[PDB]
Design a protein around this ligand. Structure first.
Ligand SMILES: *[C@@H]1O[C@H](CO)[C@@H](O[C@@H]2O[C@H](CO)[C@@H](O)[C@H](O)[C@H]2NC(C)=O)[C@H](O)[C@H]1NC(C)=O
Ligand SMILES: *[C@@H]1O[C@H](CO)[C@@H](O[C@@H]2O[C@H](CO)[C@@H](O)[C@H](O)[C@H]2NC(C)=O)[C@H](O)[C@H]1NC(C)=O
Ligand SMILES: *[C@@H]1O[C@H](CO)[C@@H](O[C@@H]2O[C@H](CO)[C@@H](O)[C@H](O)[C@H]2NC(C)=O)[C@H](O)[C@H]1NC(C)=O
Ligand code: RX8
Ligand code: RX8
Ligand code: NAG
Ligand code: NAG
Ligand code: NAG
Ligand code: NAG
Ligand code: NAG
Ligand code: NAG
Ligand code: NAG
Ligand code: NAG
Ligand code: NAG
Ligand code: NAG
Ligand code: NAG
Ligand code: NAG
Lengths: 772, 772
């Protein structure tokens, strides 16, 4: 019990080690900077509110600020919400920041500013002005930034935030910023590389602009540069998901053979979507240290068969040559130059979108002696034919990616095609060697398909066309396999011996194999688990399972079963007792997800039929309208119960008399109108309680004893129907004074009434008239 | 417009032609019979309420009743709701019905009654007592029913409603019911056919019981019998979705060879799930008239190859032999006896679940000269091989059904396996010859697959594995095809010539082909419609479409496009204008469904890009948060606008000023809190307005002018947040007195407040204190 309730609508955190006082008002529907921000505040975040102006009054007392993050209070129209459009650009009055003598970082992105704010203090190292309307950079406006190290100025002139002219940078605008390390002028309608830049630069971002030519002297003095990105100048526009204008005459970005001669420290060079047709070896004459080269989205199909430049790249770790195919050509095979065999240090090679019919072992020979190679990505190639046995020569790899091909007998889903993959907003690999054949056209498998692949630890066959009864013979070579992803196929579980040859299998995913489960009368052996002696996790979600020939699933090893998106309602049809012990003999089961099974009620017998060590149970999203809480007594190890998104109207009379073990109880999104008188009495093991999005009007102390409440890690109460009368005096006082974490106090823990108090936050509620 | 507002919570309808006054109180959450039921009431329905008793008071004034339907006021526990269980059986006091001199039909199903109710009037023709607890029938209890024609007594003793003993029927119980035509004793735990039954019977239902044997004289005197159902006596229990006990020693229902000799009028004989191994021809010696025979779910696999009995069935119209397979046998081929060729009158033949590998032309030769044959169903057979050309000999058929097989180069989904398909609760065929290959394993198609099939009007390929670029060559022989269902495949629309060879195609479904639309960078030609010159309807739902190589779809014929479940939000990304005319050149488009496209706002240009004759537009389920109503002015022929299930908060100031053509406006399930002052002023075209499930508090007269309300066919206002204060005087009076059709007045047009009035129906609201 606090003496001084916190009324500030911001989260406040103390890191006493670094003398930091962190005040986070992100997304609090503020129209002004709140009063009462601590005087010792060092980090203030006001991102995503609607504060229309800054003034000397804004940060007057806050002389210790090292960081102000004031992003996105007035976002450009095409980037922002159309339902609450910002009426007018952010107004910054003079002298708003000059008193902030300690200020090291100022983020003003996304405020529709017209100029670089002046009057900035000389302590400043980082200034961020992305997604404003600043499209002319003048030396005079940069004087104030003598000590600046990091300067983000991109996204001020592009299709989502147009300025309708070419960007302008004055000659030498940046040269006297003698500490400047990082400069980003991406997405800006820039026409030439600005010169001369300070020789202190380590990173220069010039991507997504209109630079048609690099001058031979553009990067001459940049002997500390580590990252250079020039991508998206003369873009390759085929199937671009954004408005795309190529350089005329089908020209590439014109880079002189000596343009990079000064860049002795360069580790990263990105030349994505520059419409390049050749890669001159001479580019790399004085760069020995290069680690990452991106040449995706050019027209380098022919060059890949020649590629003399690779002889200059013995320290390269990553090479990307994806999407270099020649339009309207479907090549017979892949032609990799012998020069690839020079890439001594290569760990990652990506060649998506080369677009060819047949992959053959001899085509990968240039890679045979790359000892460090960990990832080979040949996805999205429309490969029809590939003998998988070729990968016996690639046992050292971590991931072989043939995803999205047409074979028959982790990068973001948008990655190569998106406009700016580093734009800022307001998995089985860890098991060992992985062969990813997801999203192919495999319709039938047999043992011989996997000959010589016994070293594989993860096989991903998700999203193939496999419509086959498995009998234990199809995967015989895969003696080491620990993870099989068989999701999104048409498994037919006619035989209980399915998968038994995978003797080291720990995780099996057969989710989204609903096809044979959808048609009446068909045999399904759900007892196939018995044979899998180290199986830890089974996923069988979204299989629409409503019938089973076997009555029990069996396993001595299984710990986790996901059974979401089935029809246990039909299996457990009231009057039919036959499947009430379906999961009972999964003796080591700790986690069971039976959400989304249309269970509007639970027949008696379900809880008695649960296996004895069940710890985490989800019954979410079932339309459940009633629930006999007493039956939780059968679940002696139960720690997490998820009943979210149902239609429950009551809680147990005594949660302690239903379950002694329960730590996490999730009742969000139900129809609960009141709590029982002694609901939480003596529930000392309770740690997490979600009652949000219900219809609760009143809570009294008997239901919510203080010796239970003060031990919760989290208590969620938001989006209820609290009635703020004199009867609510205890709850209101308790909420205002507690240290228990209750999220959304500042925003969605609100009185609905009476009258005067409607829409008011309970945190701000003054009930003195109740005590007169 | 009314002087006497209707307060009765039942719908009341007049059919003056048959002198009927129909009062329907179905599902009105009634706990008593309401007062004020009209004295002239002829049909009274009180089904699905919680009225706990009937007495002389119940129907006292209602002397003209011809029908009382009082079903399901206390349903058996396993059949009923578990959230509102019925506490005690319905109580009927003496003399409750004897005054109802005209009563012809009494339904008392599903009330947990213990006996046949006595004191019934002699006018009664139909009595229904299904799903009660009456399991002993005595002659004495039936004397009141001298005039009874129809008697339903089933579902009184079975697994969903157990009685724990065998059913008992006294000897000759029914014999003196000399007008009895229809008797149903299904689902009753009956052990013998009751005898002697009255010779006036036309239909006898004895299915789902424990009859082990028919005696030779059980049906001797039933010379008027038309329908006999003995199914589910000695059931075939393999994969039964209900608890199933077979007769011992695998015995069939034992039927003597002469058991049916008296049944000269018999038209329908159902012997489903009787575990039959033979069908003696002698059964049918004296039945010439038989039209329908069901022999599904027996063990007749061998008999189908012999089938001498078919020689006695020259008038049979329908024959069902589905699910006769031998357990654990997968036959090479199907062996139909030559005797099938004697089925001169046959229209429908179903043989699902025979379970065989290969279908060959010669196997169907016994059917070649059945001239009347219209439907051939060989679904659910696990057929792997079938030359589709064989169906050139079957051009006279209406439907050829090979659904749910494994072929590679309309009955309810539960039908053959369900317990009782006639249990009572409380498509392209019309285009002509149909070949249904849905739910097969076809992975690649070519022209020659359809050789000799040019007569087909509808082809169903839904749910195959077709992952192929189509180029206009794959369907060349299908010259007459009007409907292609290509849904649930993996169409790759690389070429705009896809489907062009289907020159007569009127409807194309390519819904749920999302696979190639889900991976970035892939080419997709949505302009493939240009070539299809009679195409009327295109469905491309749930394709996840977020990119297109072509900018415009084109067609001179298309009238209906379904484009639901895509990502128009990504295609029309704010700042990208390229796809704003995607639909503009569908010049004859009248119907466009762009629901479920994540459209949280509509970019400007969308409405100007719509084609000119658009009449019906759905933007439902988009998360729409704002809407510029004025843009509706571009849609000059707009008649239906569906904006349901969005997050709109306001209506236009003047709908008339946004659209002159709009007739139907659907705003249900939005967040509207108030209407604009003059919302409907001069909206003379408006005919239908749905404002249900919003948050409206008050409506005043200005918003709703009488000269618009007078032309409304329907105005939906239920599930709002009406505040019943003195400011609501107009709305409350208007609702009570209007003739405009407003559904759910009895149930869901309710005050939320203030206090006293909470949960009260507005129809019942008395505001006299406002006028004092
Ligand atoms: C508070 O503000 C300071 C100043 O911007 C932040 O300091 C940065 O912290 C990380 C450590 O995780 C470093 O790698 C950066 O280089 C630091 N920058 C400077 C300029 O000191 C600090 O992280 C902020 N803390 C918050 C918001 O919690
Ligand atoms: C990028 O700069 C160009 C000019 O280099 C802008 O193009 C001009 O736009 C105006 C108004 O749209 C036209 O009337 C001029 O004719 C254009 N000039 C040229 C030379 O193209 C372009 O809009 C700028 N891009 C962005 C996104 O703001
Ligand atoms: C159908 O009738 C049989 C009796 O013919 C019922 O089975 C008996 O049930 C009692 C109580 O469960 C048992 O003690 C007897 O052993 C059973 N007898 C036999 C012969 O099986 C059965 O309960 C009835 N079915 C239903 C659905 O009520
Ligand atoms: C009407 C079918 O009844 C059971 C059944 N289930 C399957 C099944 N899940 N898959 C099958 C695959 C090939 C052949 C037969 C079957 C099969 N069958 C047929 C059977 C002979 C029993 O295997
Ligand atoms: C990275 C791929 O970009 C374009 C494309 N789209 C498809 C497509 N939808 N399907 C294909 C099928 C076979 C071979 C090539 C393609 C193909 N291709 C390759 C192309 C050469 C244009 O045909
Ligand atoms: C591979 O590519 C190079 C292009 O420089 C070409 O000279 C060579 O003939 C090609 N080999 C094959 C097998 O196509
Ligand atoms: C696949 O490659 C292996 C050699 O690693 C060989 O045994 C096998 O015969 C090849 N398969 C086919 C189908 O050519
Ligand atoms: C397998 O590939 C699919 C589809 O590409 C992906 O979503 C899935 O997570 C992968 N599976 C595993 C286990 O990594
Ligand atoms: C499993 O199927 C394969 C053919 O795909 C066959 O070789 C084998 O005999 C089958 N195994 C058993 C145990 O029946
Ligand atoms: C699985 O299902 C049933 C018993 O419930 C039986 O037909 C089959 O032999 C069983 N197989 C295993 C591995 O338990
Ligand atoms: C009214 O009851 C009579 C007699 O049962 C019946 O024939 C008629 O269909 C009923 N009408 C309606 C509308 O339910
Ligand atoms: C098919 O079936 C019957 C078995 O009932 C057998 O007598 C007959 O010879 C078989 N005929 C053919 C053509 O296989
Ligand atoms: C299918 O049968 C037809 C005769 O109707 C014949 O032309 C064709 O050869 C058969 N096709 C195949 C692939 O066997
Ligand atoms: C085609 O078959 C599927 C069932 O497999 C069914 O859902 C669909 O409605 C049928 N299509 C048509 C046009 O009848
Ligand atoms: C279309 O595809 C078929 C078979 O794949 C082939 O016969 C034909 O060459 C193709 N037509 C065109 C115009 O490419
Ligand atoms: C479809 O789209 C592209 C232009 O994006 C064009 O090449 C192609 O010929 C068009 N086809 C038709 C049938 O209009
Ligand atoms: C909307 O109302 C104004 C004022 O009456 C009128 O001038 C304007 O033309 C109207 N527009 C339409 C489309 O009716």
């Amino acid at each position: 019990a606090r003496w001084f309730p916190k009324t500030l609508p911001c989260d406040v955190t103390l890191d006493v080690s670094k003398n930091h006082v962190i005040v986070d008002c992100t997304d609090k529907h503020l129209t002004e900077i709140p009063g009462g921000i601590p005087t010792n505040t060092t980090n203030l975040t006001l991102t995503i509110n609607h504060i229309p102006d800054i003034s000397p009054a804004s940060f007057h007392r806050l002389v210790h600020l090292v960081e102000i993050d004031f992003r996105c209070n007035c976002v450009p129209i095409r980037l922002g919400s159309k339902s609450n459009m910002c009426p007018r650009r952010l107004q910054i009055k003079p002298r708003s920041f000059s008193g902030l003598t300690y200020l090291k970082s100022l983020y003003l992105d996304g405020n529709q500013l017209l100029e670089i704010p002046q009057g900035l203090p000389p302590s400043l190292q980082l200034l961020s002005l992305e997604a404003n309307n600043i499209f002319s950079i003048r030396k005079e406006q940069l004087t104030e930034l003598a000590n600046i190290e990091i300067l983000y100025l991109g996204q001020n002139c592009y299709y989502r935030n147009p300025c309708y002219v070419s960007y302008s940078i004055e000659k030498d605008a940046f040269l006297n910023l003698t500490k400047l390390k990082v400069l980003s002028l991406k997405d800006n309608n820039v026409t030439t590389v600005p010169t001369v830049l300070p020789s202190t630069l380590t990173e220069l971002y010039l991507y997504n602009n209109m630079i048609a030519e690099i001058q031979e002297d553009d990067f001459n003095n940049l002997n500390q540069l580590q990252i250079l990105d020039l991508s998206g100048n003369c873009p390759r526009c085929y199937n671009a998901p954004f408005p795309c204008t190529p350089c005329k005459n089908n020209s590439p970005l014109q880079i002189p053979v000596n343009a990079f001669d000064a860049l002795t420290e360069l580790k990263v060079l990105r030349l994505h979507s520059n419409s390049l047709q050749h890669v001159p070896p001479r580019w790399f004459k004085n760069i020995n240290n290069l680690q990452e080269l991106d040449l995706s989205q050019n027209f380098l199909a022919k060059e890949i068969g020649d590629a003399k430049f690779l002889h200059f790249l013995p320290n390269l770790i990553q090479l990307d040559l994806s999407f270099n195919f020649e339009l309207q050509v479907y090549r017979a095979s892949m032609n990799l130059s012998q020069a690839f065999s020079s890439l001594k240090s290569l760990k990652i090679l990506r060649i998506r979108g080369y677009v060819f019919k047949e992959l053959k072992s001899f085509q990968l020979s240039p890679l045979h002696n790359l000892q460090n190679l960990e990832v080979l990505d040949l996805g999205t190639n429309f490969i029809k034919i590939a003998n998988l046995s070729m990968f016996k020569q690639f046992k050292r790899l971590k991931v072989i990616d043939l995803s999205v091909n047409k074979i028959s007998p982790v990068l973001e889903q948008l990655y190569y095609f998106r406009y700016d993959k580093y734009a800022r907003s307001c998995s089985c690999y860890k098991y060992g060697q992985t062969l990813d054949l997801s999203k192919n056209s495999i319709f039938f498998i047999k043992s011989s398909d996997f000959q010589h692949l016994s070293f594989l630890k993860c096989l991903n066959l998700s999203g193939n066309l496999i419509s086959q009864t498995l009998n234990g013979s199809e995967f015989q070579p895969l003696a080491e396999l620990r993870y099989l992803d068989f999701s999104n196929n048409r498994l037919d579980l006619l035989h209980s011996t399915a998968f038994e040859e995978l003797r080291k299998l720990e995780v099996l995913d057969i989710s989204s194999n609903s096809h044979y489960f959808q048609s009446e009368g068909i045999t399904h052996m759900l007892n196939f688990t018995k044979n899998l002696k180290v199986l830890q996790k089974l996923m069988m979600n979204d299989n629409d399972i409503s019938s089973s020939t076997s009555r029990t699933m069996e396993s001595e090893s299984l710990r986790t079963l996901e059974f979401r998106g089935n029809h246990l309602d039909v299996l457990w049809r009231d009057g039919d007792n036959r499947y009430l012990q379906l999961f009972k003999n999964l003796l080591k089961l700790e986690e069971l997800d039976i959400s989304k099974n249309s269970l509007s009620f639970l027949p008696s017998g379900v809880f008695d039929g649960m296996p004895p060590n069940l710890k985490n149970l989800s019954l979410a999203k079932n339309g459940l309208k009633s629930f006999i809480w007493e039956k939780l007594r059968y679940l002696k190890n139960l720690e997490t119960l998820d009943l979210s998104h149902n239609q429950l109207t009551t809680v147990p009379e005594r949660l302690s008399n239903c379950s002694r073990s329960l730590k996490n109880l999730i009742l969000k999104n139900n129809q609960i109108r009141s709590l029982t008188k002694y609901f939480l009495q003596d529930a000392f093991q309770l740690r997490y309680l979600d009652l949000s999005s219900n219809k609760i009007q009143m809570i009294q102390k008997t239901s919510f004893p203080e010796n239970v409440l003060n031990n919760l890690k989290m208590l969620l109460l938001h989006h209820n129907r609290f009635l703020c009368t004199c009867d609510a005096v205890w709850f209101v006082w308790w909420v205002q004074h507690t240290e228990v974490t209750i999220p959304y106090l500042a925003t969605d823990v609100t009185c609905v009434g009476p009258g005067a108090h409607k829409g008011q936050s309970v945190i701000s509620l003054d009930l003195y008239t109740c005590e007169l």
